[model samples]
Target: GEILKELPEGFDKETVRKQAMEDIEIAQSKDYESWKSRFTKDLQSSLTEESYDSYLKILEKQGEFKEFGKCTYLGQIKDNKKYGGVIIVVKYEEGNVNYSLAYDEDMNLVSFTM
Candidate 1:
């Protein structure tokens, strides 16, 4: 089970919602570097070509992209640091997929699930 908590102070819901959608679009385009552009500095080194191949496989199996839904706030999560977590359900030609995202204090995407 995922840990969850009430939104902490200084949480910027508006930015969180916007960036989440933007990244979804970026990911759908299959532009790995562009997608990783928003990640926190600490996150930059974590993914490499070998693992990116795995990520591509998942999206390919899911089919072409459709659209995405609203941001469903999950809770505060500690990743690279304290972060606000959210889950955005994205539609694809095949079906719906949940994209869980967590942002660092500066709003940099610290964690994401495709």
Candidate 2:
């Protein structure tokens, strides 16, 4: 009964989705180097040389960028985990992709997957 009310105030789904779209676009266009600074140092170092090479492959497999469609709140993962407290599922038309993005209480990007 309280599921929908679980999301904290100011956790606007559309706003976060828009930010994700922009970040994804830049990453695809300029590669990780372009937005490397945006991510936490831990995340940046985790990419590594080989990891980034593989990441590119995975990203390519996600298909071409297309407009974001429906977005659903998948619920919170935990209180303060790296996975973030809120998880959102976004649908895209072109790639027939469904993305799962996690964000902290401040709405900061924590993780993204397709």
Candidate 3:
């Protein structure tokens, strides 16, 4: 059996959610530099234009960007039990996708991946 734990100590999920909204908005604009700045240092080093480009194609397939839907805070620990994250649904013209976001103990954006 496994026990579930809350996000890293002192990190408020609501506050973290607000910060994620800002970064997600920048990502929509495709402003790589500004968007990358929101990442925690460790994650920041790995994000480059190449990765960003590929990521864009995924969203592009969903159809024209519409508006963001509800942000569901589901801390699914499928991969790293250490990371807590949320899935924000992006409403598109034809389809929809969820932006998977996670944070480090520092309260900075760590990843969108598992």
Candidate 4:
């Protein structure tokens, strides 16, 4: 799979991270659509398709099956699921990338760092 390319040793992760945070803040504050577009692009550029799909699989497993308010069990999604979230964040070090996932209160993926 093709990985997104970052400038050659020119951009530090701290900078990248700050950008992510700022983007989130803007998305949450101004317009989620705009922020999301930028966020996804930046994130997708950093991850390979296989890695992204693997991450998605992890999401499916960890999220609540039922609707957000109806999940009773952890790590299992019951029927009647309403909403979900995924946050994909990147950790770049010497060109190595790591993705992390987090779920909401209902055992559904609510957010992740791209």
Candidate 5:
């Protein structure tokens, strides 16, 4: 259970990661309305009102009023029951941001840290 699964052969990690980051950047840059809606919806279900507000404030500050760019998928951690060890690093003009998150068995977000 502790062992990490090896990526399938011929799967270029960098290429796939670049694509993921590009996709997120594009979605945030061009379709912020839909992205924000979906994002808040997911968080709203899991985060408390105060926690959500606090996180929103942080994002608003770092994301430059929702206009942000550059996302990198960091390596995973193995301890969490959720998240399956997915950490993301984001770069903003102001500074860099990172999030540690996990989901429940039902796929609902269970924990998040920024």
Candidate 6:
């Protein structure tokens, strides 16, 4: 959907990702750490608390390997009413595929997986 300048010299994907995380921390202030710590906990707490696991299972059933174990937000929300999130993607027999659904702060399903 968009593009950006490539990483500076010596900066790999991990380096860029780490720097992005730090930028999020800096932008959100110290309390961001707490929210980040309990992202899924709070997500389930606010919405889909009872169905989170089942929902994930459904994804798995659909041949999607949701790498939630290491998933984190890829694009952040500019609107306070809607916090955006993304998962590290994968397939049933494949490692890491680039596909995902759009999730809201209330953890409501927004978009179907593409």
Provide TM-scores for the models: 0.77, 0.59, 0.69, 0.26, 0.42, 0.30
Candidate 3 residue-wise lDDT, 40-91, digit = tens = 6676777888656777777677776678677665342435444456676777
- Report RMSD for candidate 5: 7.1
lDDT comparison, 4 vs 5, better candidate: 5
Q: Judging by TM-score against the true structure, name the best candidate.
A: 1
> Evaluated with lDDT, which candidate comes out highest?
1
Residue-level lDDT tens digits of model 1 in 49-89: 65356777777878777777656765554543567767878
Per-residue accuracy of model 2 over 13-81 as CA lDDT, tens digit each: 566556566655655565666555545556666545553465567666666665666555533545343
Tell me how far the alpha carbon of residue 92 in candidate 1 is from the true structure, in angstroms, after superposition. Answer: 0.8
Candidate 5 runs further than 4 Å off: 1-46, 65-83
Clashes of each: 0, 0, 0, 17, 2, 0
Displacement of residue 90 (Cα, Å) in model 4 is: 12
Model 3 lDDT at residue 51:
59
- Let me know the TM-score candidate 3 reaches against the reference structure: 0.69
Residue 89 miss distance in model 4 (angstroms)? 5.8
When summed lDDT is taken over every stretch of 10 residues in candidate 6, the lowest stretch is: 2-11
- Report how far residue 112 has shifted in candidate 5, in Å: 1.2
Query: What's the lDDT for residue 24 in model 2?
Result: 58
Candidate 1: C-alpha lDDT: 0.70
Writing each residue's lDDT as its tens digit, candidate 5 over 1-114 gives: 232233232334454344334434533344444333333356644444554455556656665423323333323223653222223566765645554333333333334455
Question: Which sections of candidate 4 miss by over 4 Å?
Answer: 4-8, 32-114
Give the TM-score (vs. native) of candidate 5. Answer: 0.42
Clashing residue pairs for model 5: 83-102, 83-103
Count: clashes, candidate 5: 2
Better of 1 and 6 by lDDT: 1
Ranking by lDDT: 1, 3, 2, 5, 6, 4
